[PDB]
Specification:
binds chloride ion, Immunoglobulin-like, homohexamer, mainly beta
Chain lengths: 130, 130, 138, 130, 130, 138
């Protein structure tokens, strides 16, 4: 039940009030750049008119493959009247494949999360913000 | 057919306490998709006026059977005045049989949850939202 | 006398503290080495899945339970797909949790609730002994 | 710096607004009764016009000394307009010397906790509520 | 004398960042009491118009030195309109050197904590509230 | 150009998402294999206790830190007695936590704050390398 693994496939539905609902599956902007052998420390951050946040990530590249050995020193300043940061959390995957600083936010009309993530694979450091 | 009984609680609340055997789960909406051997990465998502959310699923398939090796990058953004998302957890079963993004919601008149789920069985990938 | 109905079995003690409040502290020996009586009289050998649920004007909730009965003794191997909708103004759900005992003798979906005049928990419970499956909501 | 271990000893202080403060130390109503050899199950409870709560305690008396091996099935119904139960928790000491069901409550003029406790020492079961 | 510096933060906030070496702790109020060899149980408490709380401390003294073997039965009841006790934790140091009952408080105009503490050193039992 | 001042060292990327918001994602290599410079120039050998603190009109907080410096290298063996008073209407403290690094290289007392126009954390930090003790509050 799959033609090509290039486009999104969705199941649609119309709710009792005539509102569309989409259940979908899809195969799959970021910052990436080279690393060096041994251990290194990095400040991973994001800055905008609304969200500003960062943390430190210690990485260790043994052989030609590295991982995040520690994620610490979480900082943040969010400017926006009425915004409520219900929760914030910095965590590292057991493998150390990545670290994420996640904020669960809320205002008068919405609830959502924002995420600053750092990923290490081989000798490559990738960051993202969603 | 199910086996049930009508109970009237002390506070007057009249309800139906029941049990029924099921073959397949009954969500609001579901979808089934075939998988190819090897590792593949997919975005699982739901979009509606009020609820919007997703996560990524890393699926691996050795010969005939496959499972979810990783459920990550949980994202959501809900729009509705006065809505509160008390809790949001993305989790994966130990056997990788499935992953579920569950939201505990609340507002001036109700308390409920919504669930975006992805389960893998053999060559099949099943998505659902309830 | 205010007929507890379990008061005849338990040893109780009326006490009062600091606040000058009057309440009864009590202890009662209970039996667990007993089978179920009211439950769904049958659940075939092997493995099977079940939908446990309570539906009413205010409280609505359910969960799935895979049950495994090898030879004669049956247990719950899993309690999943917790779902709920507690629709009523004034009512607030502060916490919800689905759990299964170590033995798999029972699974409970507990909700911590509150309204303008009270605070309390409610439980949707499924219990299994031998080839019997029973439920309760209190 | 201690005469007799029978009475309370306090350090007093007068706050900026002429309010007394007492820091004190003191050497030290409950329900108690005999147990039997082997394992047993007990319902520990309290009932009043305001607070009603209970839990089950499994006890195991090996030799002539016993302990609580499990505390479970926490139930409660508190009647009082305006009362808010911020938190509730049932826990057992590692040694199993006792179990406690603690409620952190709050209303418009106060914050306090209430506690139903079960204690086992030798072949004796003691309960209390504070 | 202490070593400090006056800092004016970006938002205009003017403060004093300092460090000072101390011999003894400086709480709002303290008390010292002698202990006898053997095990003894004590109630540690504080009473004032607004704050009232206590816990029990099991102290053991082998020949000259002693420590807290157990800090239990935490109790509190605070009176003040609009006051919120966000958190309350009773904990004991691994070495039994001390136990502390800490309350995180809040109201329309302030955020703070209060601490009822008991520390044991040798033959001495020191109580304090800050 | 809006002088970041660290922008010259880090590699940054301006991006935009779903919301149509404009922000800069960035990564910067930093050094930790460096000693302290501004800190309290002395902390004698052996063991000593210190009161770390910040006092101001709105934020006030402090904690104690036992420091152990054997031979030449010094570390924090304990961070205790966390105390605070954040007195200001509109300001809400959502969480507070005192922590010490594994190494004892530093101790941090972090507060999650909020007001009608912003959400942010503030930290009272004590760091120790060799025989140097420094502090900061940002
Ligand atoms: Cl880490
Ligand atoms: Cl029965
Ligand atoms: Cl237990
Ligand atoms: Cl420096």
């Amino acid at each position: 039940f799959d033609l090509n693994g290039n486009i999104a496939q969705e199941k649609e539905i119309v709710l009792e009030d005539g509102t569309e609902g989409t259940l979908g599956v899809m195969p799959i902007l970021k910052g990436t750049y080279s690393l060096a052998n041994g251990t290194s420390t990095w400040k991973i951050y994001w800055y905008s008119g609304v969200y500003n946040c960062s943390f430190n990530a210690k990485i260790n590249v043994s052989k030609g493959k590295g991982k995040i050995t520690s994620a610490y020193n979480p900082w943040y300043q969010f400017y926006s009247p009425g915004l409520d940061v219900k929760k914030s959390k910095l965590s590292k995957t057991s493998s150390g494949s990545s670290a994420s600083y996640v904020f669960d936010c809320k205002n008068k009309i919405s609830n959502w999360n924002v995420t600053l993530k750092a990923s290490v694979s081989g000798k490559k450091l990738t960051t993202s913000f969603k």
